[PDB]
PDB file of all heavy atoms in Angstrom:
ATOM      1  N   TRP A 740       0.807  -1.218  -0.017  1.00  0.00           N
ATOM      2  CA  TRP A 740      -0.005  -0.040   0.045  1.00  0.00           C
ATOM      3  C   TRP A 740       0.906   1.277   0.023  1.00  0.00           C
ATOM      4  O   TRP A 740       0.636   2.091  -0.850  1.00  0.00           O
ATOM      5  CB  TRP A 740      -0.945   0.039   1.234  1.00  0.00           C
ATOM      6  CG  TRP A 740      -2.050  -1.071   1.118  1.00  0.00           C
ATOM      7  CD1 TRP A 740      -2.030  -2.311   1.666  1.00  0.00           C
ATOM      8  CD2 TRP A 740      -3.270  -0.942   0.374  1.00  0.00           C
ATOM      9  NE1 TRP A 740      -3.079  -2.959   1.332  1.00  0.00           N
ATOM     10  CE2 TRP A 740      -3.943  -2.151   0.577  1.00  0.00           C
ATOM     11  CE3 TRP A 740      -3.941   0.087  -0.388  1.00  0.00           C
ATOM     12  CZ2 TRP A 740      -5.267  -2.369  -0.008  1.00  0.00           C
ATOM     13  CZ3 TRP A 740      -5.152  -0.088  -0.899  1.00  0.00           C
ATOM     14  CH2 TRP A 740      -5.807  -1.380  -0.630  1.00  0.00           C
ATOM     15  N   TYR A 741       1.815   1.463   1.048  1.00  0.00           N
ATOM     16  CA  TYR A 741       2.518   2.645   1.141  1.00  0.00           C
ATOM     17  C   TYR A 741       3.650   2.794   0.144  1.00  0.00           C
ATOM     18  O   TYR A 741       3.767   3.822  -0.634  1.00  0.00           O
ATOM     19  CB  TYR A 741       2.964   2.798   2.594  1.00  0.00           C
ATOM     20  CG  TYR A 741       1.824   3.070   3.510  1.00  0.00           C
ATOM     21  CD1 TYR A 741       1.318   1.935   4.235  1.00  0.00           C
ATOM     22  CD2 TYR A 741       1.392   4.244   3.871  1.00  0.00           C
ATOM     23  CE1 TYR A 741       0.222   2.072   5.087  1.00  0.00           C
ATOM     24  CE2 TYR A 741       0.295   4.387   4.772  1.00  0.00           C
ATOM     25  CZ  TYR A 741      -0.154   3.379   5.389  1.00  0.00           C
ATOM     26  OH  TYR A 741      -1.238   3.575   6.363  1.00  0.00           O
ATOM     27  N   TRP A 742       4.489   1.741  -0.010  1.00  0.00           N
ATOM     28  CA  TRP A 742       5.472   1.620  -1.014  1.00  0.00           C
ATOM     29  C   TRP A 742       5.445   0.260  -1.515  1.00  0.00           C
ATOM     30  O   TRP A 742       5.622  -0.795  -0.786  1.00  0.00           O
ATOM     31  CB  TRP A 742       6.858   1.885  -0.319  1.00  0.00           C
ATOM     32  CG  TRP A 742       7.998   2.002  -1.338  1.00  0.00           C
ATOM     33  CD1 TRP A 742       8.272   3.074  -2.162  1.00  0.00           C
ATOM     34  CD2 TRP A 742       9.052   1.113  -1.528  1.00  0.00           C
ATOM     35  NE1 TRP A 742       9.420   2.890  -2.898  1.00  0.00           N
ATOM     36  CE2 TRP A 742       9.865   1.645  -2.499  1.00  0.00           C
ATOM     37  CE3 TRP A 742       9.393  -0.144  -0.942  1.00  0.00           C
ATOM     38  CZ2 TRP A 742      11.019   0.976  -2.929  1.00  0.00           C
ATOM     39  CZ3 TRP A 742      10.409  -0.768  -1.408  1.00  0.00           C
ATOM     40  CH2 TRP A 742      11.269  -0.260  -2.423  1.00  0.00           C
ATOM     41  N   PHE A 743       5.199   0.119  -2.826  1.00  0.00           N
ATOM     42  CA  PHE A 743       4.841  -1.098  -3.548  1.00  0.00           C
ATOM     43  C   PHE A 743       5.991  -2.162  -3.442  1.00  0.00           C
ATOM     44  O   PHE A 743       5.691  -3.321  -2.858  1.00  0.00           O
ATOM     45  CB  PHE A 743       4.374  -0.870  -4.915  1.00  0.00           C
ATOM     46  CG  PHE A 743       4.031  -2.134  -5.686  1.00  0.00           C
ATOM     47  CD1 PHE A 743       2.838  -2.704  -5.604  1.00  0.00           C
ATOM     48  CD2 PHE A 743       4.912  -2.598  -6.650  1.00  0.00           C
ATOM     49  CE1 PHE A 743       2.570  -3.922  -6.327  1.00  0.00           C
ATOM     50  CE2 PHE A 743       4.697  -3.809  -7.329  1.00  0.00           C
ATOM     51  CZ  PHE A 743       3.447  -4.377  -7.218  1.00  0.00           C
ATOM     52  N   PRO A 744       7.176  -1.957  -3.951  1.00  0.00           N
ATOM     53  CA  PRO A 744       8.113  -3.060  -4.002  1.00  0.00           C
ATOM     54  C   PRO A 744       8.973  -3.321  -2.786  1.00  0.00           C
ATOM     55  O   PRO A 744      10.172  -3.429  -2.918  1.00  0.00           O
ATOM     56  CB  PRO A 744       8.983  -2.512  -5.206  1.00  0.00           C
ATOM     57  CG  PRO A 744       9.041  -0.974  -4.993  1.00  0.00           C
ATOM     58  CD  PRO A 744       7.669  -0.675  -4.481  1.00  0.00           C
ATOM     59  N   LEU A 745       8.218  -3.610  -1.749  1.00  0.00           N
ATOM     60  CA  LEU A 745       8.843  -4.139  -0.480  1.00  0.00           C
ATOM     61  C   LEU A 745       9.403  -5.524  -0.578  1.00  0.00           C
ATOM     62  O   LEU A 745      10.046  -6.009   0.307  1.00  0.00           O
ATOM     63  CB  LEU A 745       7.880  -3.945   0.694  1.00  0.00           C
ATOM     64  CG  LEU A 745       7.616  -2.617   1.241  1.00  0.00           C
ATOM     65  CD1 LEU A 745       6.472  -2.561   2.258  1.00  0.00           C
ATOM     66  CD2 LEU A 745       8.897  -2.074   1.912  1.00  0.00           C
ATOM     67  N   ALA A 746       9.060  -6.177  -1.797  1.00  0.00           N
ATOM     68  CA  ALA A 746       9.464  -7.551  -1.984  1.00  0.00           C
ATOM     69  C   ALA A 746      10.967  -7.671  -2.137  1.00  0.00           C
ATOM     70  O   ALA A 746      11.464  -8.782  -2.205  1.00  0.00           O
ATOM     71  CB  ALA A 746       8.849  -8.119  -3.260  1.00  0.00           C
ATOM     72  N   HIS A 747      11.775  -6.535  -2.199  1.00  0.00           N
ATOM     73  CA  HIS A 747      13.214  -6.690  -2.241  1.00  0.00           C
ATOM     74  C   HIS A 747      13.803  -7.194  -0.924  1.00  0.00           C
ATOM     75  O   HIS A 747      14.836  -7.792  -0.979  1.00  0.00           O
ATOM     76  CB  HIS A 747      13.833  -5.259  -2.500  1.00  0.00           C
ATOM     77  CG  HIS A 747      13.525  -4.756  -3.903  1.00  0.00           C
ATOM     78  ND1 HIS A 747      13.852  -5.296  -5.079  1.00  0.00           N
ATOM     79  CD2 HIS A 747      12.777  -3.680  -4.251  1.00  0.00           C
ATOM     80  CE1 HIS A 747      13.431  -4.604  -6.081  1.00  0.00           C
ATOM     81  NE2 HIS A 747      12.615  -3.594  -5.619  1.00  0.00           N
ATOM     82  N   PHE A 748      13.117  -6.995   0.145  1.00  0.00           N
ATOM     83  CA  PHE A 748      13.478  -7.595   1.501  1.00  0.00           C
ATOM     84  C   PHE A 748      13.287  -9.074   1.483  1.00  0.00           C
ATOM     85  O   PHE A 748      13.660  -9.790   2.531  1.00  0.00           O
ATOM     86  CB  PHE A 748      12.853  -6.935   2.633  1.00  0.00           C
ATOM     87  CG  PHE A 748      13.136  -5.411   2.611  1.00  0.00           C
ATOM     88  CD1 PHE A 748      12.282  -4.477   2.179  1.00  0.00           C
ATOM     89  CD2 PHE A 748      14.235  -5.042   3.381  1.00  0.00           C
ATOM     90  CE1 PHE A 748      12.566  -3.130   2.285  1.00  0.00           C
ATOM     91  CE2 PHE A 748      14.594  -3.674   3.545  1.00  0.00           C
ATOM     92  CZ  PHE A 748      13.745  -2.815   2.957  1.00  0.00           C
ATOM     93  N   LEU A 749      12.592  -9.808   0.537  1.00  0.00           N
ATOM     94  CA  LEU A 749      12.365 -11.145   0.471  1.00  0.00           C
ATOM     95  C   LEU A 749      13.669 -11.962   0.205  1.00  0.00           C
ATOM     96  O   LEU A 749      13.709 -13.089   0.496  1.00  0.00           O
ATOM     97  CB  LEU A 749      11.219 -11.447  -0.422  1.00  0.00           C
ATOM     98  CG  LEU A 749      10.834 -12.946  -0.686  1.00  0.00           C
ATOM     99  CD1 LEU A 749      10.229 -13.502   0.534  1.00  0.00           C
ATOM    100  CD2 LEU A 749       9.869 -13.084  -1.963  1.00  0.00           C
ATOM    101  N   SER A 750      14.645 -11.323  -0.353  1.00  0.00           N
ATOM    102  CA  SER A 750      15.859 -11.990  -0.722  1.00  0.00           C
ATOM    103  C   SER A 750      16.636 -12.452   0.614  1.00  0.00           C
ATOM    104  O   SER A 750      17.304 -13.438   0.427  1.00  0.00           O
ATOM    105  CB  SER A 750      16.701 -11.046  -1.509  1.00  0.00           C
ATOM    106  OG  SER A 750      17.173  -9.955  -0.784  1.00  0.00           O
ATOM    107  N   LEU A 751      16.513 -11.780   1.623  1.00  0.00           N
ATOM    108  CA  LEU A 751      17.170 -12.227   2.842  1.00  0.00           C
ATOM    109  C   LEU A 751      16.572 -13.485   3.451  1.00  0.00           C
ATOM    110  O   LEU A 751      17.202 -14.160   4.263  1.00  0.00           O
ATOM    111  CB  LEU A 751      17.166 -11.089   3.876  1.00  0.00           C
ATOM    112  CG  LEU A 751      17.899  -9.802   3.492  1.00  0.00           C
ATOM    113  CD1 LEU A 751      17.704  -8.774   4.607  1.00  0.00           C
ATOM    114  CD2 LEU A 751      19.412 -10.072   3.343  1.00  0.00           C
ATOM    115  N   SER A 752      15.295 -13.820   3.090  1.00  0.00           N
ATOM    116  CA  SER A 752      14.693 -15.016   3.564  1.00  0.00           C
ATOM    117  C   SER A 752      14.780 -16.243   2.676  1.00  0.00           C
ATOM    118  O   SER A 752      14.207 -17.254   2.964  1.00  0.00           O
ATOM    119  CB  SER A 752      13.146 -14.722   3.787  1.00  0.00           C
ATOM    120  OG  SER A 752      12.554 -14.325   2.498  1.00  0.00           O
ATOM    121  N   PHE A 753      15.597 -16.107   1.619  1.00  0.00           N
ATOM    122  CA  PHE A 753      15.631 -17.291   0.720  1.00  0.00           C
ATOM    123  C   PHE A 753      16.459 -18.418   1.395  1.00  0.00           C
ATOM    124  O   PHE A 753      17.567 -18.213   1.935  1.00  0.00           O
ATOM    125  CB  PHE A 753      16.436 -16.791  -0.584  1.00  0.00           C
ATOM    126  CG  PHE A 753      15.641 -15.888  -1.483  1.00  0.00           C
ATOM    127  CD1 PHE A 753      16.199 -15.198  -2.432  1.00  0.00           C
ATOM    128  CD2 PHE A 753      14.232 -15.808  -1.279  1.00  0.00           C
ATOM    129  CE1 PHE A 753      15.465 -14.375  -3.259  1.00  0.00           C
ATOM    130  CE2 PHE A 753      13.549 -14.981  -2.191  1.00  0.00           C
ATOM    131  CZ  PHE A 753      14.107 -14.226  -3.026  1.00  0.00           C
ATOM    132  N   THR A 754      15.847 -19.532   1.506  1.00  0.00           N
ATOM    133  CA  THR A 754      16.485 -20.669   2.089  1.00  0.00           C
ATOM    134  C   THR A 754      16.798 -21.794   1.011  1.00  0.00           C
ATOM    135  O   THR A 754      15.597 -22.457   0.614  1.00  0.00           O
ATOM    136  CB  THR A 754      15.699 -21.340   3.267  1.00  0.00           C
ATOM    137  OG1 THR A 754      15.631 -20.255   4.243  1.00  0.00           O
ATOM    138  CG2 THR A 754      16.390 -22.475   3.841  1.00  0.00           C
ATOM    139  N   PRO A 755      17.899 -22.084   0.593  1.00  0.00           N
ATOM    140  CA  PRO A 755      18.155 -23.182  -0.343  1.00  0.00           C
ATOM    141  C   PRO A 755      17.757 -24.451   0.250  1.00  0.00           C
ATOM    142  O   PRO A 755      18.184 -24.785   1.397  1.00  0.00           O
ATOM    143  CB  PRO A 755      19.650 -23.034  -0.782  1.00  0.00           C
ATOM    144  CG  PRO A 755      19.831 -21.645  -0.526  1.00  0.00           C
ATOM    145  CD  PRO A 755      19.131 -21.277   0.713  1.00  0.00           C
ATOM    146  N   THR A 756      17.136 -25.420  -0.516  1.00  0.00           N
ATOM    147  CA  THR A 756      16.790 -26.803  -0.042  1.00  0.00           C
ATOM    148  C   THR A 756      17.601 -27.755  -0.856  1.00  0.00           C
ATOM    149  O   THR A 756      17.353 -27.945  -2.051  1.00  0.00           O
ATOM    150  CB  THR A 756      15.345 -26.963  -0.253  1.00  0.00           C
ATOM    151  OG1 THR A 756      14.923 -26.806  -1.599  1.00  0.00           O
ATOM    152  CG2 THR A 756      14.535 -25.972   0.589  1.00  0.00           C
ATOM    153  N   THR A 757      18.513 -28.417  -0.201  1.00  0.00           N
ATOM    154  CA  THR A 757      19.444 -29.539  -0.782  1.00  0.00           C
ATOM    155  C   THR A 757      20.211 -30.106   0.347  1.00  0.00           C
ATOM    156  O   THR A 757      20.405 -29.454   1.396  1.00  0.00           O
ATOM    157  CB  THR A 757      20.239 -28.911  -1.919  1.00  0.00           C
ATOM    158  OG1 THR A 757      20.943 -29.978  -2.527  1.00  0.00           O
ATOM    159  CG2 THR A 757      21.236 -28.027  -1.276  1.00  0.00           C
ATOM    160  N   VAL A 758      20.834 -31.154   0.136  1.00  0.00           N
ATOM    161  CA  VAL A 758      21.784 -31.849   1.020  1.00  0.00           C
ATOM    162  C   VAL A 758      23.094 -31.916   0.418  1.00  0.00           C
ATOM    163  O   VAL A 758      23.352 -32.549  -0.575  1.00  0.00           O
ATOM    164  CB  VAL A 758      21.298 -33.263   1.354  1.00  0.00           C
ATOM    165  CG1 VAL A 758      22.278 -33.941   2.274  1.00  0.00           C
ATOM    166  CG2 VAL A 758      20.032 -33.233   2.099  1.00  0.00           C
ATOM    167  N   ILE A 759      24.044 -31.105   0.891  1.00  0.00           N
ATOM    168  CA  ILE A 759      25.452 -30.945   0.411  1.00  0.00           C
ATOM    169  C   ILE A 759      26.346 -31.481   1.450  1.00  0.00           C
ATOM    170  O   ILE A 759      26.522 -30.937   2.499  1.00  0.00           O
ATOM    171  CB  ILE A 759      25.774 -29.405   0.076  1.00  0.00           C
ATOM    172  CG1 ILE A 759      24.880 -29.020  -1.049  1.00  0.00           C
ATOM    173  CG2 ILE A 759      27.179 -29.379  -0.343  1.00  0.00           C
ATOM    174  CD1 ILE A 759      24.956 -27.523  -1.346  1.00  0.00           C
ATOM    175  N   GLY A 760      27.016 -32.656   1.045  1.00  0.00           N
ATOM    176  CA  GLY A 760      28.040 -33.135   1.911  1.00  0.00           C
ATOM    177  C   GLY A 760      29.395 -32.454   1.743  1.00  0.00           C
ATOM    178  O   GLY A 760      29.674 -32.106   0.680  1.00  0.00           O
ATOM    179  N   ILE A 761      30.048 -32.457   2.764  1.00  0.00           N
ATOM    180  CA  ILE A 761      31.568 -31.784   2.718  1.00  0.00           C
ATOM    181  C   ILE A 761      32.432 -32.663   3.500  1.00  0.00           C
ATOM    182  O   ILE A 761      32.293 -33.052   4.694  1.00  0.00           O
ATOM    183  CB  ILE A 761      31.519 -30.446   3.369  1.00  0.00           C
ATOM    184  CG1 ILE A 761      30.626 -29.441   2.525  1.00  0.00           C
ATOM    185  CG2 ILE A 761      32.903 -29.871   3.513  1.00  0.00           C
ATOM    186  CD1 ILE A 761      30.442 -28.080   3.120  1.00  0.00           C
ATOM    187  N   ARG A 762      33.471 -33.138   2.823  1.00  0.00           N
ATOM    188  CA  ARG A 762      34.545 -33.947   3.429  1.00  0.00           C
ATOM    189  C   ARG A 762      35.626 -33.095   4.020  1.00  0.00           C
ATOM    190  O   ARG A 762      36.226 -32.239   3.297  1.00  0.00           O
ATOM    191  CB  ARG A 762      35.222 -34.884   2.438  1.00  0.00           C
ATOM    192  CG  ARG A 762      36.260 -35.852   2.973  1.00  0.00           C
ATOM    193  CD  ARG A 762      36.740 -36.818   1.948  1.00  0.00           C
ATOM    194  NE  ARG A 762      37.781 -37.689   2.399  1.00  0.00           N
ATOM    195  CZ  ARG A 762      38.177 -38.791   1.741  1.00  0.00           C
ATOM    196  NH1 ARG A 762      37.790 -39.016   0.538  1.00  0.00           N
ATOM    197  NH2 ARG A 762      39.127 -39.576   2.251  1.00  0.00           N
ATOM    198  N   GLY A 763      35.903 -33.333   5.322  1.00  0.00           N
ATOM    199  CA  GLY A 763      36.896 -32.527   6.046  1.00  0.00           C
ATOM    200  C   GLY A 763      38.330 -32.670   5.613  1.00  0.00           C
ATOM    201  O   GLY A 763      39.179 -31.806   6.145  1.00  0.00           O
ATOM    202  N   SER A 764      38.577 -33.793   4.967  1.00  0.00           N
ATOM    203  CA  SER A 764      40.010 -34.114   4.513  1.00  0.00           C
ATOM    204  C   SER A 764      40.511 -33.035   3.579  1.00  0.00           C
ATOM    205  O   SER A 764      41.549 -32.299   3.809  1.00  0.00           O
ATOM    206  CB  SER A 764      40.168 -35.422   3.989  1.00  0.00           C
ATOM    207  OG  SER A 764      41.416 -35.710   3.541  1.00  0.00           O
ATOM    208  N   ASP A 765      39.806 -32.856   2.441  1.00  0.00           N
ATOM    209  CA  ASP A 765      40.221 -31.842   1.463  1.00  0.00           C
ATOM    210  C   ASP A 765      39.385 -30.467   1.681  1.00  0.00           C
ATOM    211  O   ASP A 765      39.633 -29.611   0.864  1.00  0.00           O
ATOM    212  CB  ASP A 765      39.913 -32.378   0.073  1.00  0.00           C
ATOM    213  CG  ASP A 765      38.538 -32.773  -0.167  1.00  0.00           C
ATOM    214  OD1 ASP A 765      37.715 -32.835   0.708  1.00  0.00           O
ATOM    215  OD2 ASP A 765      38.129 -33.120  -1.369  1.00  0.00           O
ATOM    216  N   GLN A 766      38.504 -30.373   2.569  1.00  0.00           N
ATOM    217  CA  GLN A 766      37.632 -29.207   2.734  1.00  0.00           C
ATOM    218  C   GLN A 766      36.855 -28.788   1.499  1.00  0.00           C
ATOM    219  O   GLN A 766      36.675 -27.700   1.119  1.00  0.00           O
ATOM    220  CB  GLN A 766      38.379 -28.113   3.223  1.00  0.00           C
ATOM    221  CG  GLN A 766      38.970 -28.316   4.590  1.00  0.00           C
ATOM    222  CD  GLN A 766      37.950 -28.419   5.771  1.00  0.00           C
ATOM    223  OE1 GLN A 766      36.937 -27.806   5.723  1.00  0.00           O
ATOM    224  NE2 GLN A 766      38.198 -29.361   6.747  1.00  0.00           N
ATOM    225  N   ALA A 767      36.337 -29.934   0.850  1.00  0.00           N
ATOM    226  CA  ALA A 767      35.562 -29.734  -0.361  1.00  0.00           C
ATOM    227  C   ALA A 767      34.320 -30.597  -0.341  1.00  0.00           C
ATOM    228  O   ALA A 767      33.984 -31.246   0.651  1.00  0.00           O
ATOM    229  CB  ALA A 767      36.563 -30.101  -1.619  1.00  0.00           C
ATOM    230  N   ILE A 768      33.690 -30.585  -1.480  1.00  0.00           N
ATOM    231  CA  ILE A 768      32.383 -31.382  -1.690  1.00  0.00           C
ATOM    232  C   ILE A 768      32.690 -32.639  -2.377  1.00  0.00           C
ATOM    233  O   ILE A 768      32.972 -32.642  -3.631  1.00  0.00           O
ATOM    234  CB  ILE A 768      31.370 -30.443  -2.439  1.00  0.00           C
ATOM    235  CG1 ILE A 768      30.988 -29.264  -1.548  1.00  0.00           C
ATOM    236  CG2 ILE A 768      30.145 -31.338  -2.585  1.00  0.00           C
ATOM    237  CD1 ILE A 768      30.135 -28.287  -2.311  1.00  0.00           C
ATOM    238  N   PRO A 769      32.550 -33.847  -1.743  1.00  0.00           N
ATOM    239  CA  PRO A 769      32.769 -35.021  -2.501  1.00  0.00           C
ATOM    240  C   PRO A 769      31.624 -35.414  -3.335  1.00  0.00           C
ATOM    241  O   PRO A 769      30.639 -34.742  -3.340  1.00  0.00           O
ATOM    242  CB  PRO A 769      32.851 -36.028  -1.271  1.00  0.00           C
ATOM    243  CG  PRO A 769      32.203 -35.527  -0.198  1.00  0.00           C
ATOM    244  CD  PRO A 769      32.321 -33.988  -0.346  1.00  0.00           C
TER     245      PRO A 769
END
C-alpha cells in the first residue's frame, strides 16, 4: 500500500533446499 516493491527484502529470507556433503579431509564437496 504505502510503498509497493517491498519484496526486495524477501531476498534475505531465501533458504536453499538441498543436502550438500563436505569432506573435512580436502575441505571440499565429495
Side-chain angles (χ1 to χ4, degrees):
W740 291 95
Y741 293 92
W742 187 79
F743 176 81
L745 287 171
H747 297 291
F748 296 97
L749 180 65
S750 64
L751 296 174
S752 64
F753 292 162
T754 299
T756 59
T757 187
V758 176
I759 294 171
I761 294 171
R762 181 177 181 171
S764 178
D765 59 353
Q766 295 300 321
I768 296 170

